[PDB]
From Swiss-Prot, chains A, B, C, D, E, F:
Plays a role in virion assembly by joining the head and the tail at the last step of morphogenesis. Six FII proteins probably bind protein W that closes the DNA-filled capsid, as well as the U tail terminator protein of the pre-assembled tail. May bind head-to-tail joining protein W and protein U. GO terms for cellular component: host cell cytoplasm; virion component. Keywords: Host cytoplasm, Late protein, Viral capsid assembly, Viral release from host cell, Virion. It is found in: Virion; Host cytoplasm. Pfam families: Phage_attach. The lineage of its organism: Viruses, Duplodnaviria, Heunggongvirae, Uroviricota, Caudoviricetes. The keyword Cell inner membrane does not apply. This is Head-tail connector protein FII. The keyword Nucleotide-binding does not apply. One of its GO terms (biological process) is virion assembly.
UniProtKB/Swiss-Prot annotation, chains G, H, I, J, K, L:
The lineage of its organism: Viruses, Duplodnaviria, Heunggongvirae, Uroviricota, Caudoviricetes. InterPro entries: GpU-like_sf (IPR038512), Phage_lambda_GpU-like (IPR009312), Phage_tail_protein-like_sf (IPR035934). It comes from the Viruses. This is Tail tube terminator protein. SUPFAM superfamilies: Phage tail protein-like (SSF143749). The gene is U.
Amino acid sequence: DFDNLFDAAIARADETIRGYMGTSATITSGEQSGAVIRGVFDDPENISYAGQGVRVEGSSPSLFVRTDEVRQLRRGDTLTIGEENFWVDRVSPDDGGSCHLWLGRGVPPAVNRR
Amino acid sequence: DFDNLFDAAIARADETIRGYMGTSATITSGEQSGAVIRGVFDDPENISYAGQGVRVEGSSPSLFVRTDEVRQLRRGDTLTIGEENFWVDRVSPDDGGSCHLWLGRGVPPAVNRR
Amino acid sequence: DFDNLFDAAIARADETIRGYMGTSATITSGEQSGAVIRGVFDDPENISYAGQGVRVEGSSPSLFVRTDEVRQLRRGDTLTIGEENFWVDRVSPDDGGSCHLWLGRGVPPAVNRR
Amino acid sequence: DFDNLFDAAIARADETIRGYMGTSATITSGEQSGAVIRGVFDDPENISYAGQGVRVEGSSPSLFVRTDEVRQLRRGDTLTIGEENFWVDRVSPDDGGSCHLWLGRGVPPAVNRR
Amino acid sequence: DFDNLFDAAIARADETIRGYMGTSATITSGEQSGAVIRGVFDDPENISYAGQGVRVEGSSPSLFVRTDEVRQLRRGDTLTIGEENFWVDRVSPDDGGSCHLWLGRGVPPAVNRR
Amino acid sequence: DFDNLFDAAIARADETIRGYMGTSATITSGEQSGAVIRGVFDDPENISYAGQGVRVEGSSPSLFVRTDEVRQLRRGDTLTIGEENFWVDRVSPDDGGSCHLWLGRGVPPAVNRR
Amino acid sequence: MKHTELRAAVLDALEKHDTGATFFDGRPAVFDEADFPAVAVYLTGAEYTGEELDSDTWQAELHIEVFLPAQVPDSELDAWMESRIYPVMSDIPALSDLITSMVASGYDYRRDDDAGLWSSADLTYVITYEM
Amino acid sequence: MKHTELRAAVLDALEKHDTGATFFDGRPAVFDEADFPAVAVYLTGAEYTGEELDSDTWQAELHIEVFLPAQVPDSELDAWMESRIYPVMSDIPALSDLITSMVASGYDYRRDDDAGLWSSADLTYVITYEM
Amino acid sequence: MKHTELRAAVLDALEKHDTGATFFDGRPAVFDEADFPAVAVYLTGAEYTGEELDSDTWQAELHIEVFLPAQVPDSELDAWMESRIYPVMSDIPALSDLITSMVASGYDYRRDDDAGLWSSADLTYVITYEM
Amino acid sequence: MKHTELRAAVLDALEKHDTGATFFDGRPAVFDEADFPAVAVYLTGAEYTGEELDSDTWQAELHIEVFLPAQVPDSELDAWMESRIYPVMSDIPALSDLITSMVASGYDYRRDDDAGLWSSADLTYVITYEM
Amino acid sequence: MKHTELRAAVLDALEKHDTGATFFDGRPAVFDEADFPAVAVYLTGAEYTGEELDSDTWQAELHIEVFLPAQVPDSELDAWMESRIYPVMSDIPALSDLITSMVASGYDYRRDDDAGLWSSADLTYVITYEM
Amino acid sequence: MKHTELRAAVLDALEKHDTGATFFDGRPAVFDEADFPAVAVYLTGAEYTGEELDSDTWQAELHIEVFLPAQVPDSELDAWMESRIYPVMSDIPALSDLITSMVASGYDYRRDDDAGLWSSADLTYVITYEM
């Protein structure tokens, strides 16, 4: 398929780890509108202190989804993790077989471009 | 129940480690009120000098209990570990089957809600 | 040819790895003009924060081709990999049998020589 | 002795390692007055520079004795290790089966409490 | 030779690696004048930005010479690597059987001793 | 003598390693004065630039010899590593079976005590 | 000091309007994702500017901050500051009873750089009080 | 405040000029290599310059940042400054009615040091206004 | 020397009121989880402000620190300081006899940020004396 | 903007004499060990101080940076600047007419402490120009 | 030269009374736990404020540093620095011979933050002397 | 040029005095442990203070440095500087004719805190000259 001899194994490994690790997240809105994908979700904890005490302890959701199913995902559209809903804040470049979707909570803040 | 084939394994792992390590403590106050939950309490050291010498050597207690009973725990409520008394001040996000609980000592300082 | 008994082996290793995991790259412009080489493309990601906050998202693509063909390439010329077009910004020194190629995106910004 | 399955093992490990490593120490003053405690003594080096050159090379001795017998010790107390005399400046909390003892040198410095 | 039982083995080992690794080089000028020494030449890449972008990217050649025959190599005399000439800048202290030779590029800049 | 069943073993290890590496040397002046002791000498390299550039590339001579033979050494003591001459500037506290001798080169700079 | 009842009065004067934000008083804050965009006020300064030999006539500065999650556009912060804080606090008789003079000093923006978990707009006023 | 309205007005006045570069409002930015060289605009300062006991007469600063690809020579930045922004803003009725006095303050360059991702050019004005 | 003398005098002045906070003197302090909210007193400065050809008449800064556990709200800090600290040095004959003149300079707050072990409030006063 | 043509004119003037260096224009530079000792010219500042009620009368600063390999002695740096740039720029008719006034400000040196792959000498001038 | 003579004279003036501490001259110090609490004197500054067209009349700043164990309370530090050194240094005829004007500057405390290896106090004294 | 001949003349003035130290000119220095305690001279500053219209009268600064063994006490540095350089720098006819005026500004010390392989004693001269 591709002149790699290695990316094929990479893609097979990615499919296997999607199957054995992670959950099914369905997307809402955007050009994809409603669609169901399999991805491994993680949510590391991050805290900022700002002034004297402004502990705003939060989370940094990532999904690590294959680029093929998330082509032209844009940023404004939202995402749902089963019962929970998110919105894609950024998309990493593909490493060869997939990338990472970094998510924020709630509703995206406006558009603010024109 | 778990749509991953791996979260069941991680739940078994967490219950096994909580059964073979740590202790059980009785939650005090809060919506749980009288109840007993088993976790793995650790407590590293923390040092702050403030001024020239104002060293306030203390401790950083953590519990790391599973996510099921840690729900509706809030922050102001207290907790007694064995014979000692503590109180929850921060809860980590779920790592898949559990979350870390950070414990201060004595009485929580006020509420200052409004 | 190589007075090391090690340079031949490392060159063999580099050739084998480029064959078994690399991809075709179509150099455009420059003295080589239209030509085809084999390189191990990668696109590590980096983020910059300008001002109070500016999430300028980008990456630093690299190729790591052998030096023998990468000779006489300079910096002004561009590169096309499959469907993607890049342009060389810097060539690392030879490690013995190869060197990294750092790529920008799109058109190189002017020349600004004299 | 506890709902651990692990603390008993770690306590046996602590007593074995105290019998195999470290030496006896004769406490002086304090509520224990004259008593013998087996602890794993170490004397790492730490040097400050203060001004331009004020190298004040010394040591940061530790004893790291078991938790149970370290109670009711405080800080103004001192101790002797064979031929040499020390004084405890810090005591760590129990990590599960023991606790470190951080030592100064010579006579404890004053009281200065009120 | 020497009351080491370890430095002799070190010398044998480094002589073996010098034979099986690196290249031979011809020395120009200096008290050694025309001489050839086998050493492991490498050249890591180092860059500097000065202002925001003034990229002055360069490299730092090293040789890992053996003191036994690179005695009194000084700094002023130049060194030819294959068909290219560099110049010695730093000679590291002997590890017991050898040391490191550091190279600039081109001709050393003046002398400026007086 | 050694009440640990480990101190004798580590002393044997230290004497074996000192006999198997680092050769011996002699002491010039000092309380020991004429005395030959076997140790493990090393010369790590250090660089400083002071001003704009004043590179002062040099060594950090260390000996790491047994503690008993080097009592009452003080700091004005000198010695010679065979043909090379040194002077002890610092003595590390014993780690249990050994101590580090940190030495400078040439004549120690003055005394400036009283 | 009077700063306790001063903070109480100013927060009451703030809350008289429509709600929509947590009003954590003083410093502890601690937000998490439950009490999103909110307001918090506190005091700093408290020197001995005398300026008259009849009373100490101390002075300090109040900082009231609006915190909004993530990277919301600055227009929302501008509108919130101009609608929820600026006019309502402009005339509070109780504060004029507790203090002598109230004067605006500054109003700035900031936001976190690592993961940008927050974005705050700060407003500082200068207060002259006797104690 | 009027900062949102004034920013929108000046943004529309700039957008009246020929397009070709995106006109992101405010500060959150977030570009990615899809909306390359473009411009953003926002406000800072907002102090309490009274100058008279008749109105607030506040003063602030207007920041305009134009972003160019990586390491383009600064000649292009000068061309963009004198071809897109600085001359066209010399006379706009909207700002004249919205604000009292506007003065140019600064015009500088700065590009990303590590990895040389971008190159921003800053134009800073000082504006007096009311609320 | 009067540093120890004045430190003891102010320490006893605080002690003569109600207790409830430890009374660490000097500098080393060292609290641990036994010596929570407490008070310390020390001096800084010690210049050569002559100001008169009769004696050195030095002047310095008296610092009084009160330490509280972790994230106690600032209002409690204000209440504690006013109920315990501020009035006692309003008039002390020992202060009058020991030094020449005493005057307050500032009252500030700070807190531990990394792991938040402690919080502190400082009373800084200017003390002129002839040792 | 006349900055580009000003740089072009000054680089032509310094190219009037003998070559021996590269003539990078503006910031990006990119020297590398193939474009051995070179020179570049760029501008900073560009503020809006009027000092005459008729026009903008901007003022900027001009940097002329000459780059030499690594650790060359400063004596040859002085010889380079006293032969290649400083005399040649002492009087240029095109540059004299293009700007209003020209004054020298300073002349200094820089070098890479770590690694040490370059040595730069900077000529800083102040230029008053009208646009 | 005078600095060696000045240091010798001041150290002798220290040694006249009862001992109790090492008198490390110069600067390099190097203590270890065998020459514990001790005192050293060193010099900095060396300016050329001429003030008269008869001689250089240079000025310097002598620091008398004293080191005590780790975190000893400031009580013994005050006792030492107001009784052991301060009174005896108030009048030294040899320095008055060698010094034009002798004016006190200040006095300070500090503690070793990392691991508390020492506690130090410094008498800083400005000197006007002619070489 | 002027800097080259100034450095040559001062080096000659040092060399005519009793020698014993290397006379490394220029910035690169580079010592290793064989050219120990030694002197070097270099120049910085080079600004455009006017003082008249007929002559430009640039002023600069002369750094004079000497390097000694690591933690050698300051007595050796004082003796060396005040016996071998400062008396020599009292008057040199070559420097007198080459420059307009020479004045003394500063004299300081430094040493390698980490590693500790040297001690540096520096003098800072101020020179006014015309080119």
